[PDB]
Structure formats: structure tokens, C-alpha cells
Amino acid sequence: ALRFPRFSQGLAQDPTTRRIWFGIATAHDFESHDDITEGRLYQNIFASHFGQLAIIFLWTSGNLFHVAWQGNFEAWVQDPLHVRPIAHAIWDPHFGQPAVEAFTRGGALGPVNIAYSGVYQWWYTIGLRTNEDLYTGAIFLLFLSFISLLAGWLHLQPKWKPSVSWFKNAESRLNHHLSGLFGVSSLAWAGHLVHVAIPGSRGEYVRWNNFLSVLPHPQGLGPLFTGQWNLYAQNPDSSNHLFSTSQGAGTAILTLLGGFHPQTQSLWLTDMAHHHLAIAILFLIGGHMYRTNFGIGHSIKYILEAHIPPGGRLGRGHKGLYDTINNSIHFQLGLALASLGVITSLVAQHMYSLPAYAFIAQDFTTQAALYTHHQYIAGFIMTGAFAHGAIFFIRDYNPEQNADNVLARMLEHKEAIISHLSWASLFLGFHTLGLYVHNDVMLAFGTPEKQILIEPIFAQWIQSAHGKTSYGFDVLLSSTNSPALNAGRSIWLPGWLNAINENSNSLFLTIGPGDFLVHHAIALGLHTTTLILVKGALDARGSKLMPDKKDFGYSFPCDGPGRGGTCDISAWDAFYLAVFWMLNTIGWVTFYWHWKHITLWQGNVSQFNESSTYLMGWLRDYLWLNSSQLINGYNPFGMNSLSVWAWMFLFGHLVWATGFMFLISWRGYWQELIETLAWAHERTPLANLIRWRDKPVALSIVQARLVGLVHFSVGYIFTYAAFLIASTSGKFG
């Protein structure tokens, strides 16, 4: 110990500046710290979880506070489609007078930023109506962040810290998460919708003062205990209904209409309340599967032991997988990040196609910002899922306790998995690029008719299968005779078919050959990013080049210039290489989404359908064309409110290019340069009276890869966020 970092003696005894960097970069790697035990490991993780929850509650609390203080929420409720919501107020003493003038918008007294997170529509749809309601929620979350820190501190003293056996109680944890954390929370949310949100959506302001007096339904509760639940679905709202008023209001609380509210263009609030209630009670029954202290339930160990196919095509099946995952926190985090990244992308794909918050589909800047945000979030989460999968193989995988099960068999034929992932990436890359270049050459020579435009007929057939008419393939939901259509005409199909064939929303947009080419670029990005992460995770314990890689850990610089050269041979470097492909993949995904919508919102879908089939169209008719108002955020003749993006736009270009220095130039050059600088300081008068207490050295090789990747990613995200919002909000459509 003796000095920073107190958890690593070898870092503390470093005489150079490297002591500080590695002390920061390894603060949360509890397993590498000195004198760590399984108890201290789970306990520090437990308290870190509480601290995170406190962070999240405090963050949401602050968001409510500024919307209620400097925001537009009360004025925005009156005009949902004519009021620009306010994020907070701007107080920058570097502002010139015109900067104050151009940034004063949304109907405020001083300069303000226009919020683009969608919390206004979210809070209006759930029942919040006045700034006082937002102040109440902020105090509650500030108080919740307080008790989160309280519980985190509480379980760090003896007799409150639990044993590692308590953390390894998987059966009880799953039952409670499915029953309580998943189901009871969804059940209570359905309760909030049917008490406050739905009546709030009909003109009735239900709050804590009067929620005990009002009835959510005229004949409340009674039918629920009888079985005549259909009385809760009798009188929905008319298709000619105004959200904050009562003209067209009904009295139903649980419906299955299937479409959108025609005015708000968001999902039916009764449908959402019924949805949460149905999935909740489904989670409640499902949360009674595993065995606890009552003599009934399953042993997850025994279920895994019993799933072994005779004939031995999977060897010993899943035997030993229970303890393999229950003892490895990296395995559990890998599964958690994998599932979370999938449902994060699921949220992205559904919030733009099935908007659930009132008056959010018309806020085009908000829809673009939200989809881009979650897709990059999900991309990072997926890279982390595979990163911790490799970390599990190195730090926790016991080959003898996983003998001849499915997990060890993955390693047994690692070459087959990696080679075929390589073939699929090569196939997709060769052909997708080739077709794009072919069409580029055709349009260069002025012969558009010679392009190769393949019709995405399989996804078109699926859209017709959902009842879309634009392609006329006459399958179920699109054909009058299929039983899939007859069984649903009574319920969701009227509203569903009404919404899918509306040419304004984005519920299953019309797709053409341009969409076929972009989706194959997406397949290339997914396959190659998967290839990088899987090859690194399977070759993490060893390779023909370095058969003892597991002894060197997860993150090390290299193995030297011997044996031909072993640069970027660790699994950490595999992650580091895959993040570039993740950013490239999400870049393709979001370039696709933003261009299709920004042409749809402009009513010019033909420009996308005709220009997305060749890459010169992407450079010219998407990036170059939409950058106009952005780059003119400030010109030699003045500026407007888009200047903050024109600046951030260039800011992102700088950080990104700065990362190239850390990624192209490597260490030894900078070490010799620092040596020539240390001599300069020791031989300079006056200044040599100042002595450094940490020896200046060049950044570590792994540190350089990390710093270069962080600059690359920060520039990536900030450059695109600036262009996205400025090109969309500059038009607002």
C-alpha cells in the first residue's frame, strides 16, 4: 500500500507517472486488488450496485428539477405540437449579445437549450401536468437516491454484509426478480396507468390528495372478482378524442385496440395499461418455478444435468454449467450484457415504429436522437458482453469441471466457428461492396438502367404477412381467407391494419432495393464485429502462436517481436479492434435510419429510394446536403442557435483525429522524446528549482490503445450527434 493506489502495491511502488494512470484505470477491477477474497468481492459489488442506483435516481431527479424550474412543461401541455420543450437555462459568460439573442427560444426569458430526450412527452403521457408534479417527483427521487446510499453503506458493516452463499442463492433470486422486480412492478405500473394516467388522459387530474375518492371505472373492482372482465373494455375513447380534454372520452381501462390514438399518434393508453397487467401476472406465475424453503420447485442444477442428448452429439450436455456460472461473476455479467444489449436494440426498433408517448412522433429531432442514443448504447453493451465472455474464459473457466460439455466443446472446435464467421463476413463484404461499386460506376457513366437493384422480397413478403398492401402478395392478414385474419378481426386487427397502412407513421416502412443493400451492410457489420469478438474470446486462453496466453492475463501489451511479431494478440486487443467495427456498424445503422426518416419527414421518399442504391448518393444527398444549416451555424456574417452544433461538430472531428495519434504512432518514439525533455528541464536555470515527484514516461502500449479508442469513440459520437440534431432540428422535419 503506502500510497495511491492503496489497493495495488506494485502500482504504488512505481516511480513514474504510470502509477497514477493505472491507479485510476484499475479502481473497479476488484479481483486484481491486493488481499481480495470472495466475500470482499461480492460485497464491494453489492455496494457499487447501490451507488449506481443512487446515481440514477439523482440524475433523474435533476432532470425533473430543471424542467420544472427553467422549462416549458406547463406551457408545453397546452400546445404539444407548437411549443419547443426546454432542457435547462444557459448561463455562459463567454456569450456575446447575439449569442444570447439567438439562443433565447421556446418562450423563455434567457438563453435555453431545446430538450431532445422526450421527457416532456413521456411525463405528459403518464399524468404529470404541472411543474409542481415535477418538483414532487424530483424530491422523491432525491430521497430515493439518499436511501440507496443508505443501503449501500448499511451492507458494508459486519452482520449486514451477506455471505457468498447468499449471493450464490440463484433460485431465490430468480423467483423474486420474476415475481416482484418484474411482475409486481409491472402490476403497480398498470395500477398507475388506470388510476392517474388514463383518467389524466380524460381530463381528470388524479393526485395523492384525491386518488382515494375517484373511481378508475364506474363499476370498479366488482367484475374483476367475478370473471366478467370485459366490462373494463366496454367504452373506449372515440377516434375523435383530444388528449387533455374529455370530448370523445370513454370509461374503459383495459383494452386491446391495436392501433394508435389518432390525435397523439401514440399507443392507446388503455392498451399499455392492459399490456403491463398481462405481462405482470404472467411474470407473477412464472416466478414460482425454482425451489426455496417450502419443498416445491426446481433445482437449476438438476435441470442442467438432465439436458443431455443420448448419442452424445453434445457430449455431456450442460453438466457442471450451474456451478460454472454461479461461481463466475464474469459469466453472469456476459449473459446480462448480452440480453440487455438485445432488448436495448429492441427498444430502439420499437419506440420509433410504435411510439407510446403522446405527441412524440411529430418531434422528429427527438425520435432521431432517441433511436441513435439507444443503438450506440446497445452497440457498446454488446461489445462488453463478449469482452466479459473472454474475461470469464481466462479468469474463471475450469476445464476439468466443464469436461466434454457444451462449453468446452466450443473451445474444441474453435477453428470451425472462427473460419465460418470469416467466410460469412467475406461473402457479405465482397458482394455488398461489389454491388455498391457496380451501381456507382453505372451512374458515373450515366446509365442508371444497368444497376443491380435486388428487391428485398422476403421482408416485403413479411410486411404483407402483417397486412401491408403496398406489395400485394396476398398472404395472411393481407388475404381475406387466411384464419390468421379471421381470428383477429374482432380485436386488434382493426386498429393494427389501420395503422400499418397509414403512410405517415413508421410502422413497417416501405422498403426497396436500397434497403436491401443497407441491410446486407448491416449483416456485414454484425458478422465481422461478432467475428472479432468471438475469435478473441475463443483464442483468449491460447493459440498456436501463444499456447500459454491464459498465464499472461486478459490485457497485456504483446509477447515481443519474436516468433514473427505478436502485436495486438491479447483478447483485450480483440475487444479494442471490435469497437471500431461496432462504431462502423452502428454508424451504418443510424445513417440508414436518419436518412430514411429525414426524407420521409420531408415528404420526399423518392430521393432515398433512388439515391440509397449507390454510395455517391449517400455522400452527396445525405451528409453533404443536410450539413448546410449546420456548418452555417456561424459564418463570417453572424450566427444562429445552430452554432453550438457547428462548434461541437468540429469538436468531434478534432477528438476523433486526435485519437489517430495514439493509434498510429506508438510508444517508443514518445519515450525517447520524453527523455530529451527531461534533460532539457534539468539543465534549464530557474525551472530546475522545480522537481517532478513522478518520473515522466510515455503512455503504456495498452494505455495508448485505450486512449486512442476513447478519443475515436468520443469524436465519433459527438460528431454524429451534432450533425444529427442540427440537420433535423434545423428543419424540424
Binding site: 500500500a1 500510497r3 497514477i20 448561463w91 513522478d694
Partner: peptide
């Protein structure tokens, strides 16, 4: 009026105290 007090308190005074205190702790010896 409150921004005229808290914006410098978090962009000037807070990083000043934070960077100076972290410098003393990082450079401290036992």
C-alpha cells in the same frame, strides 16, 4: 441570480479544490 453563483462554484471553485486535493492525495507518502 442563482446561476451567477453556482456556475462559477462548479466550473471554477469546485475543479480548483478537487484538482488540488487530488494532487495532494496522489503525491502523498507514508
Amino acid at each position: 441570480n442563482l446561476p451567477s453563483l453556482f456556475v462559477p462554484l462548479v466550473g471554477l471553485l469546485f475543479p480548483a479544490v478537487a484538482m488540488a486535493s487530488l494532487f495532494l492525495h496522489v503525491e502523498k507518502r507514508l
